[PDB]
Amino acid sequence: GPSVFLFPPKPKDTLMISRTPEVTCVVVDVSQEDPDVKFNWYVNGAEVHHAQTKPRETQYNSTYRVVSVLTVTHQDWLNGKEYTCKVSNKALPAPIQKTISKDKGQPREPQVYTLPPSREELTKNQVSLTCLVKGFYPSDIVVEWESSGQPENTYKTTPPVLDSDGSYFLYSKLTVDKSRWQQGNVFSCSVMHEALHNHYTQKSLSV
Amino acid sequence: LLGGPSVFLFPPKPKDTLMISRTPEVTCVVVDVSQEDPDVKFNWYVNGAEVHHAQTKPRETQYNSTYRVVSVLTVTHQDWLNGKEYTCKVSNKALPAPIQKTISKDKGQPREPQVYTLPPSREELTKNQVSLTCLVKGFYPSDIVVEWESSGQPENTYKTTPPVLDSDGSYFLYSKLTVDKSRWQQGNVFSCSVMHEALHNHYTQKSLSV
Amino acid sequence: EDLPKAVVFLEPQWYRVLEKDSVTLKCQGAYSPEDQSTRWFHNESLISSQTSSYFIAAARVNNSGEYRCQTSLSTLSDPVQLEVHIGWLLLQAPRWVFKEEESIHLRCHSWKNTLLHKVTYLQNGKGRKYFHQNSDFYIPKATLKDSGSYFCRGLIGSKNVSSETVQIT
Numbered sequence: 402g403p404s405v406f407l408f409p410p411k412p413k414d415t416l417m418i419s420r421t422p423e424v425t426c427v428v429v430d431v432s433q434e435d436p437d438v439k440f441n442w443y444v445n446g447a448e449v450h451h452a453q454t455k456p457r458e459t460q461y462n463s464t465y466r467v468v469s470v471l472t473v474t475h476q477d478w479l480n481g482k483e484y485t486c487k488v489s490n491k492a493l494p495a496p497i498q499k500t501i502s503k504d505k506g507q508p509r510e511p512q513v514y515t516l517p518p519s520r521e522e523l524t525k526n527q528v529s530l531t532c533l534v535k536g537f538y539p540s541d542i543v544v545e546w547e548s549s550g551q552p553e554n555t556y557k558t559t560p561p562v563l564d565s566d567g568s569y570f571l572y573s574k575l576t577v578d579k580s581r582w583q584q585g586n587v588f589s590c591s592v593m594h595e596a597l598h599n600h601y602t603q604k605s606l607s608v
Numbered sequence: 609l610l611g612g613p614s615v616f617l618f619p620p621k622p623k624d625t626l627m628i629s630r631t632p633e634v635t636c637v638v639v640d641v642s643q644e645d646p647d648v649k650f651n652w653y654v655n656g657a658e659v660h661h662a663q664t665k666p667r668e669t670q671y672n673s674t675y676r677v678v679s680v681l682t683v684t685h686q687d688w689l690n691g692k693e694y695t696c697k698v699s700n701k702a703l704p705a706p707i708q709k710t711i712s713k714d715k716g717q718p719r720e721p722q723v724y725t726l727p728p729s730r731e732e733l734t735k736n737q738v739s740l741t742c743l744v745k746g747f748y749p750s751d752i753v754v755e756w757e758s759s760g761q762p763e764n765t766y767k768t769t770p771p772v773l774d775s776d777g778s779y780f781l782y783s784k785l786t787v788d789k790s791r792w793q794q795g796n797v798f799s800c801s802v803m804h805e806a807l808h809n810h811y812t813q814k815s816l817s818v
Numbered sequence: 819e820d821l822p823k824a825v826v827f828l829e830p831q832w833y834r835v836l837e838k839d840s841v842t843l844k845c846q847g848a849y850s851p852e853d854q855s856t857r858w859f860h861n862e863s864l865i866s867s868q869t870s871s872y873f874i875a876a877a878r879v880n881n882s883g884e885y886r887c888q889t890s891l892s893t894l895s896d897p898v899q900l901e902v903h904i905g906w907l908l909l910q911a912p913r914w915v916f917k918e919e920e921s922i923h924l925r926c927h928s929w930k931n932t933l934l935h936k937v938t939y940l941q942n943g944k945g946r947k948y949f950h951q952n953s954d955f956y957i958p959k960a961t962l963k964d965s966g967s968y969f970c971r972g973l974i975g976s977k978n979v980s981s982e983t984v985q986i987t
């Protein structure tokens with residue numbers, strides 16, 4: 402039968418309040434006949450129709466890709482209410498269901514450090530800032546860079562890795578022109594996560 | 609059960625493939641083999657070759673009733689990372705096609721991965737434990753090996769990041785070795801060793817201190 | 819041009835056949851008016867079976883080539899080609915000459931009639947009609963650019979497997 406892959410809300414979307422988050426439930430691999438499927442979403446067990454859905458997007462395999470949204474309130478998804486997609490199709494003899502919640506457990510504040518450009522890597526073209534986040538959990542983190550007051554371009558991020566004491570860390574790299582750094586400018590590595598000064602912090606650096 | 613079995617073929621680990629005199633492997637696992645006595649029979653090639661480089665190691669089964677089989681291949685050094693191809697050509701009664709994967713590949717833009725290590729960061733100095741950092745960038749052969757030493761013992765409780773794709777297309781990565789405040793303020797010499805395909809005798813270390 | 823030319827009919831209606839399928843050839847036009855004769859012709863040779871049908875239960879490579887049939891009359895049947903490919907899936911077809919319009923009936927054939935999940939047929943990399951279980955693709959009236967490569971992909975339990983190019987113009 403068809404298959405469903407309950408995706409979770411983007412961390413940045415559920416961190417703070419700027420964009421209302423969604424718990425996307427995607428049902429892929431369904432034929433041109435026997436499509437038409439309904440969704441009985443459960444938020445611990447209360448349905449509630451208010452679960453808008455996307456149109457019958459066709460994919461390069463005739464396969465109808467039905468998609469569905471469920472706007473979950475910003476203040477809830479962090480409590481851990483288990484959200485449940487339930488799909489029933491003529492192709493599936495039995496309905497299939499998928500539920501996901503907070504990456505469970507308990508967290509840890511990730512106090513962050515900003516390691517500077519290494520001395521010898523300066524007598525070369527452009528140089529590299531580093532921002533080390535260490536000791537936290539879960540993996541619903543976001544790292545961004547800022548200069549003066551506008552977000553910076555040239556930056557990449559290392560994925561989280563499991564440390565010795567059951568925690569994750571990453572090394573956010575930012576390449577900047579040696580001319581634009583040696584002379585002196587202010588660069589701030591900001592990070593958002595569910596266990597900080599109300600979802601946010603940032604640490605600056607210069608010389 | 610059944611459904612037709614499968615094959616997997618991985619390269620050797622980087623330390624064994626680069627450094628001399630460390631016998632580099634090449635294995636062919638055959639998972640999901642079972643019940644009706646389907647047997648072994650391997651045969652490798654490089655583009656035309658010969659056996660003599662394997663002999664299976666019994667029948668791991670454990671849990672899901674599938675007689676699991678794997679065999680090795682003792683590769684050269686001046687040979688691999690140089691051109692050769694490698695095939696496993698497996699075969700079995702229940703599989704109606706002698707199928708097999710190839711490997712080698714990951715090619716292109718090797719160059720100086722001039723490594724840049726770092727000290728702790730100011731505020732780190734309060735907590736009982738601070739972490740030294742070692743960044744590597746300027747290397748494209750996807751994989752690499754990174755280790756740590758302190759005067760001369762394998763410090764076995766650092767942690768290393770997995771490589772990613774930087775801007776220009778040369779991979780970069782990080783490593784983090786945690787030491788107590790006292791050991792870093794003692795003044796011990798720490799070295800971040802790195803081995804990759806494009807280095808003089810394939811090695812580097814940037815001993816760091818305060 | 820003398821006697822009516824017999825011809826060769828297939829069982830089933832596919833010629834690209836795999837490595838352990840059953841295939842059965844038979845002949846018409848002809849028929850020994852009282853004591854059924856045959857004289858099947860393999861690759862331009864002879865076989866002893868004397869049956870107005872011809873068995874091949876365990877078909878394998880050596881059973882490909884040209885086949886013909888000449889019963890008592892039957893002039894000389896024009897040749898028919900039989901193909902066997904090793905592998906898992908195939909795109910079994912009746913004809914490969916579809917100009918402007920005729921009937922199209924393709925089968926994404928398995929191996930040892932072992933079922934398939936999530937099979938799809940393809941139009942030069944693009945998909946056209948996906949079904950969940952195994953089934954055939956039928957179309958009447960040609961689409962003037964089915965002229966191209968066709969094949970099919972399927973998932974046997976979990977192993978994902980493809981078939982071979984068949985361009986039909």
Ligand SMILES: *[C@@H]1O[C@H](CO[C@@H]2O[C@@H](C)[C@@H](O)[C@@H](O)[C@@H]2O)[C@@H](O[C@@H]2O[C@H](CO)[C@@H](O[C@@H]3O[C@H](CO[C@H]4O[C@H](CO)[C@@H](O)[C@H](O)[C@@H]4O[C@@H]4O[C@H](CO)[C@@H](O)[C@H](O)[C@H]4NC(C)=O)[C@@H](O)[C@H](O[C@H]4O[C@H](CO)[C@@H](O)[C@H](O)[C@@H]4O[C@@H]4O[C@H](CO)[C@@H](O)[C@H](O)[C@H]4NC(C)=O)[C@@H]3O)[C@H](O)[C@H]2NC(C)=O)[C@H](O)[C@H]1NC(C)=O
Nearest residue numbers: 405406407408409411425427429430460461462464936938
């Ligand atoms: C018909 O075509 C479509 C689409 O065609 C192709 O689409 C992609 C993949 C490209 O290759 C295109 O060029 C091409 O046209 C086919 O639909 C695809 O089907 C496969 C199934 O094999 C799905 O793979 C799954 O992918 C998810 C992750 O999905 C993200 O990444 C995809 C690839 O990068 C990307 O395409 C998706 O858009 C998606 O990206 C995220 O999307 C969400 C919302 O959709 C969005 O909010 C995010 O922001 C966005 N983020 C990013 C970075 O893109 C992956 O999770 C699946 O893994 C599950 O299954 C694996 C096998 O079992 C297993 O290894 C995994 O661990 C995981 O298993 C599950 O894990 C947890 C617990 O561990 C739990 O959920 C389950 O218990 C467990 N098991 C199961 C069974 O769920 C898997 O890798 C493609 O996403 C999907 N593409 C779609 C829908 O667009 C379709 O198959 C074709 N049909 C035929 C017959 O061929």
Ligand SMILES: *[C@@H]1O[C@H](CO[C@@H]2O[C@@H](C)[C@@H](O)[C@@H](O)[C@@H]2O)[C@@H](O[C@@H]2O[C@H](CO)[C@@H](O[C@@H]3O[C@H](CO[C@H]4O[C@H](CO)[C@@H](O)[C@H](O)[C@@H]4O[C@@H]4O[C@H](CO)[C@@H](O)[C@H](O)[C@H]4NC(C)=O)[C@@H](O)[C@H](O[C@H]4O[C@H](CO)[C@@H](O)[C@H](O)[C@@H]4O[C@@H]4O[C@H](CO)[C@@H](O)[C@H](O)[C@H]4NC(C)=O)[C@@H]3O)[C@H](O)[C@H]2NC(C)=O)[C@H](O)[C@H]1NC(C)=O
Nearest residue numbers: 615616618621633635637639640671672673674676678709
């Ligand atoms: C019955 O028996 C066992 C049960 O074991 C089970 O193992 C897991 C799944 C848990 O559930 C356990 O609880 C359980 O006991 C099953 O055997 C296993 O089956 C799985 C899949 O079913 C295989 O996974 C594959 O793993 C390879 C990589 O394998 C290394 O990493 C594994 C974990 O990541 C590790 O467990 C392996 O041992 C192996 O590790 C190597 O081991 C050798 C042996 O000594 C050692 O020398 C090496 O140093 C060591 N290396 C490392 C790094 O650990 C992975 O590559 C496979 O992914 C393929 O398929 C994916 C989906 O198709 C795809 O995303 C991947 O990219 C890759 O696909 C290929 O990728 C490239 C291009 O990207 C290309 O080659 C191909 O195009 C593409 N596709 C294909 C088809 O090749 C996959 O994840 C295990 O290897 C296997 N054996 C074990 C665990 O020992 C068995 O399947 C069970 N049967 C059933 C029906 O379930």
Ligand SMILES: *[C@@H]1O[C@H](CO)[C@@H](O)[C@H](O)[C@H]1NC(C)=O
Nearest residue numbers: 860861879880881882883884
């Ligand atoms: C029939 O022809 C095919 C293809 O030319 C060939 O492979 C096969 O060997 C021939 N059969 C015999 C019995 O020689």
Ligand SMILES: *[C@@H]1O[C@H](CO)[C@@H](O)[C@H](O)[C@H]1NC(C)=O
Nearest residue numbers: 970971972977978979980981
């Ligand atoms: C499975 O087949 C399809 C195309 O036939 C492709 O999308 C996918 O990469 C294939 N998997 C492997 C391992 O080749």
